[PDB]
Amino acid sequence: LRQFIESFIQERLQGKLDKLQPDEDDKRQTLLATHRREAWLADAARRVGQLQLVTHTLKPIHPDARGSNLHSLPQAPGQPGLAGSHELGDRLVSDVVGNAAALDVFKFLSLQYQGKNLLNWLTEDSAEALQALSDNAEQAREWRQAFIGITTVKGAPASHSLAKQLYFPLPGSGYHLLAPLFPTSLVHHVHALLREARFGDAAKAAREARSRQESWPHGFSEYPNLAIQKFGGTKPQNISQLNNERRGENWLLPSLPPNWQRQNVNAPMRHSSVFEHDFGRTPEVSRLTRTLQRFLAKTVHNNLAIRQRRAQLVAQICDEALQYAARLRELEPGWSATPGCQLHDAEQLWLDPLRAQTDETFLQRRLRGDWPAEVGNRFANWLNRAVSSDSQILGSPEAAQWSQELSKELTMFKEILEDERD
Amino acid sequence: SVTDPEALLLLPRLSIQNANAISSPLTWGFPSPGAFTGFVHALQRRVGISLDIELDGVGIVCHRFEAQISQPAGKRTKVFNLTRNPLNRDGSTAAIVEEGRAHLEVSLLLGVHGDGLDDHPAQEIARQVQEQAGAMRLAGGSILPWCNERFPAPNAELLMLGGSDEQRRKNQRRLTRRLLPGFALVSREALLQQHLETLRTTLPEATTLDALLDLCRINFEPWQVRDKPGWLVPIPAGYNALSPLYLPGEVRNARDRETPLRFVENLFGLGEWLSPHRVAALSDLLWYHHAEPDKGLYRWSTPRFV
Amino acid sequence: LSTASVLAFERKLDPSDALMSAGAWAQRDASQEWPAVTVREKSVRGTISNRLKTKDRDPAKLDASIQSPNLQTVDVANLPSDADTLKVRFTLRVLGGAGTPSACNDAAYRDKLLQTVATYVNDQGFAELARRYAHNLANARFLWRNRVGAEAVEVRINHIRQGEVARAWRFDALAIGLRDFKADAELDALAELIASGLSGSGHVLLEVVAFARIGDGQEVFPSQELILDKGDKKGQKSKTLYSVRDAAAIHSQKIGNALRTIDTWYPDEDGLGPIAVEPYGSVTSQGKAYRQPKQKLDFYTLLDNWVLRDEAPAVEQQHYVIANLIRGGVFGEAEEK
Amino acid sequence: LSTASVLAFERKLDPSDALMSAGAWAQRDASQEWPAVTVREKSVRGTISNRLKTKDRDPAKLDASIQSPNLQTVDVANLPSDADTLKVRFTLRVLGGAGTPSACNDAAYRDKLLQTVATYVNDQGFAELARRYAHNLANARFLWRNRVGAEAVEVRINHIRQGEVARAWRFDALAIGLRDFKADAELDALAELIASGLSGSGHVLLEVVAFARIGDGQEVFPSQELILGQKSKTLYSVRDAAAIHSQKIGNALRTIDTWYPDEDGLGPIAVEPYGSVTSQGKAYRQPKQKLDFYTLLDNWVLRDEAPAVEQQHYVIANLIRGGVFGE
Amino acid sequence: MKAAYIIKEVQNINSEREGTQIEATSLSQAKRIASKEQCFHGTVMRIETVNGLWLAYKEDGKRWVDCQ
Amino acid sequence: MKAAYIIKEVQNINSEREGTQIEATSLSQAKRIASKEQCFHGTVMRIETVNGLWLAYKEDGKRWVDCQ
Q: Do residues B302 and B34 make contact, with C-beta atoms less than 8 angstroms apart? A: no
B257 → chain C, closest CA residue? C105
Q: Do residues A180 and A166 make contact, with C-beta atoms less than 8 angstroms apart? A: yes
CA A141, CA A126: separation in Å to the nearest integer?
Answer: 31
Nearest CA among B250, B297, B239 for reference residue A180? B239
Residues of chain C with Cβ-Cβ distance to B91 below 8 Å are 282, 287-289
A306 secondary structure, DSSP code: H
Answer whether E9 sits within 8 Å of C71, measured CB to CB: no
Q: Do residues E7 and E30 make contact, with C-beta atoms less than 8 angstroms apart? A: yes
Checking DSSP bridges between strand C219-220 and strand C103-104, what pairing results, if any?
A: unpaired
Residues of chain A with Cβ-Cβ distance to C229 below 8 Å are 228, 230
Q: Bridge-partner residues for A182, per DSSP?
A: A57
- Residue in C107, C231, C336 closest to B75 by CB: C231
CB within 8 Å of D238: residues ≥ 6 apart: C40, C78, C81, D17, D19
Q: Do residues B162 and B16 make contact, with C-beta atoms less than 8 angstroms apart? A: no
- Residue in C6, C228, C246 closest to A161 by CB: C6
Answer whether A255 sits within 8 Å of B29, measured CB to CB: yes
Resolution in Å, one decimal place: 2.6
Nearest CA among D138, D98, D148, D132 for reference residue D254? D132
For an interface test with C, give the residue of E14, E35, E53 to mutate (most C CBs within 10 A): E14
CA A283, CA A267: separation in Å to the nearest integer?
Answer: 14
What is residue C206's three-state secondary structure?
Answer: strand
Nearest CA among D71, D91, D15, D47 for reference residue D252? D15
CA F50, CA F48: separation in Å to the nearest integer?
Answer: 7
CA B182, CA B108: separation in Å to the nearest integer?
Answer: 12
Method for this entry: cryo-EM
- Residue in C52, C73, C233 closest to E40 by CB: C52
For an interface test with C, give the residue of E8, E12, E39 to mutate (most C CBs within 10 A): E39
Nearest CA among D19, D161, B28 for reference residue A253? B28
CA C310, CA C109: separation in Å to the nearest integer?
Answer: 12
What is residue F1's three-state secondary structure?
Answer: coil
Q: Do residues F17 and F9 make contact, with C-beta atoms less than 8 angstroms apart? A: yes
* Count of pairs with CB atoms under 8 A, one residue in C, one in E: 60
CB within 8 Å of A263: residues ≥ 6 apart: A281
Q: Do residues D252 and D144 make contact, with C-beta atoms less than 8 angstroms apart? A: yes
Nearest CA among A382, A174, A354, A358 for reference residue A278? A382
- Residue in B65, B216, B262 closest to A178 by CB: B262
Measured on CA atoms in the order B108, B114, B118, B120, is the torsion positive or negative?
negative
C123 secondary structure, DSSP code: T
Cα Rg of chain D, angstroms:
23
Q: Do residues E44 and E9 make contact, with C-beta atoms less than 8 angstroms apart? A: yes
Rounded to the nearest angstrom, the minimum Cα separation between A253 and chain E is 21
- Residue in C25, C43, C148 closest to D226 by CB: C43
Torsion over CA of D190, D193, D194 and D196, rounded to 10 degrees? 160
Q: Do residues D231 and D73 make contact, with C-beta atoms less than 8 angstroms apart? A: yes
Checking DSSP bridges between strand A249-255 and strand B27-29, what pairing results, if any?
A: parallel
Answer whether A256 sits within 8 Å of B65, measured CB to CB: yes
Q: Do residues B172 and B282 make contact, with C-beta atoms less than 8 angstroms apart? A: yes
Measured on CA atoms in the order C139, C143, C147, C153, is the torsion positive or negative?
negative
CA C77, CA B243: separation in Å to the nearest integer?
Answer: 54
CA F27, CA F16: separation in Å to the nearest integer?
Answer: 21
Query: How far does CA C327 lie from the centroid of its chain?
Result: 11
- Residue in B88, B142, B252 closest to C16 by CB: B142
Answer whether F66 sits within 8 Å of A214, measured CB to CB: no
DSSP E strands: which ranges in D95-164?
103-104, 153-160
- Residue in A66, A230, A264 closest to C337 by CB: A66
Q: Do residues A88 and A185 make contact, with C-beta atoms less than 8 angstroms apart? A: yes
Residue ranges of domains in chain B: 5-182, 183-302
Longest Cα–Cα distance in chain E: 33
CB within 8 Å of A388: residues ≥ 6 apart: none
Answer whether C107 sits within 8 Å of B257, measured CB to CB: yes
Rounded to the nearest angstrom, the minimum Cα separation between A212 and chain F is 5
Residues of chain B with Cβ-Cβ distance to A224 below 8 Å are 76, 216
* Count of pairs with CB atoms under 8 A, one residue in A, one in B: 296
A66 → chain C, closest CA residue? C337
Residues of chain A with Cβ-Cβ distance to F25 below 8 Å are 214-215
Angle at the Cα of C54 from the Cα atoms of C50 and C58, rounded to 5 degrees: 80
Longest Cα–Cα distance in chain B: 71
Residues of chain C with Cβ-Cβ distance to E51 below 8 Å are none
Nearest CA among A282, A226, A65, A233 for reference residue A158? A65
SS3 letters across C149-172? CCCEEEEEEEEECCCCEEEECCEE
Q: Do residues D73 and D42 make contact, with C-beta atoms less than 8 angstroms apart? A: yes
Answer whether A215 sits within 8 Å of F1, measured CB to CB: yes
For an interface test with A, give the residue of B75, B166, B175, B253 to mutate (most A CBs within 10 A): B253
Query: How far does CA C146 lie from the centroid of its chain?
Result: 14
Q: Do residues C196 and C204 make contact, with C-beta atoms less than 8 angstroms apart? A: yes
A160 → chain C, closest CA residue? C334
What is residue D129's three-state secondary structure?
Answer: helix
Answer whether A177 sits within 8 Å of B255, measured CB to CB: yes
A274 secondary structure, DSSP code: S
CA B93, CA B95: separation in Å to the nearest integer?
Answer: 7
Answer whether C72 sits within 8 Å of E18, measured CB to CB: no
User: D223-229 long-range CB contacts below 8 Å, 24 or more apart?
Assistant: D223/D248, D224/C43, D225/C42, D225/C43, D226/C43, D226/C45, D226/C71, D226/C73, D226/E16, D228/C73, D228/C235, D229/D43, D229/D71, D229/D72, D229/D73
The helix (H) or strand (E) run that includes residue C188 is helix C186-199
A122 burial level (CB within 10 Å; 0-12, 13-18, 19+): exposed
- Residue in B38, B239, B290 closest to A180 by CB: B239
Give the DSSP per-residue string, D211-261.
EEE--TTPEE---BPPP---EEE-B-BSSSBBEE-HHHHHHTTS--B---S
Half-sphere exposure at residue D78, Cβ-oriented, CA atoms within 13 angstroms: 11
Rounded to the nearest angstrom, the minimum Cα separation between D209 and chain E is 34
Rounded to the nearest angstrom, the minimum Cα separation between B119 and chain A is 24
C144 touches chain B (CB under 8 A): no
> Chain C residues with CB-CB distance to D under 8 A?
24-26, 40, 42-45, 47, 49-52, 57-59, 62-63, 66-67, 69, 71, 73, 78, 81, 84, 145, 148-149, 151, 213-219, 235, 285-288
Q: Bridge-partner residues for C208, per DSSP?
A: C90, C157
Domain that holds residue E16: 1-68
Domain count, chain F: 1
Residues of chain D with Cβ-Cβ distance to C40 below 8 Å are 238
Answer whether E68 sits within 8 Å of A234, measured CB to CB: no
Name residues 223-282 of chain A within 8 A of E (Cβ). Answer: 234, 247
Residue ranges of domains in chain C: 1-10+98-125+262-337, 11-97+126-261
At C40, the amino acid letter reads R
Angle at the Cα of A129 from the Cα atoms of A126 and A134, rounded to 5 degrees: 150
Longest Cα–Cα distance in chain D: 73
Q: Do residues B207 and A76 make contact, with C-beta atoms less than 8 angstroms apart? A: no
Torsion over CA of D77, D81, D82 and D87, rounded to 10 degrees? 10
Nearest CA among E19, B186, A309, D205 for reference residue C215? D205
CA D163, CA D156: separation in Å to the nearest integer?
Answer: 16
Nearest CA among B172, B69, B168, B57 for reference residue B109? B57
What is residue A80's three-state secondary structure?
Answer: coil
* Count of pairs with CB atoms under 8 A, one residue in A, one in F: 14
At C47, the amino acid letter reads T
Q: Do residues A158 and B253 make contact, with C-beta atoms less than 8 angstroms apart? A: yes
Answer whether E41 sits within 8 Å of C50, measured CB to CB: yes
B76 touches chain C (CB under 8 A): no
D41 secondary structure, DSSP code: E
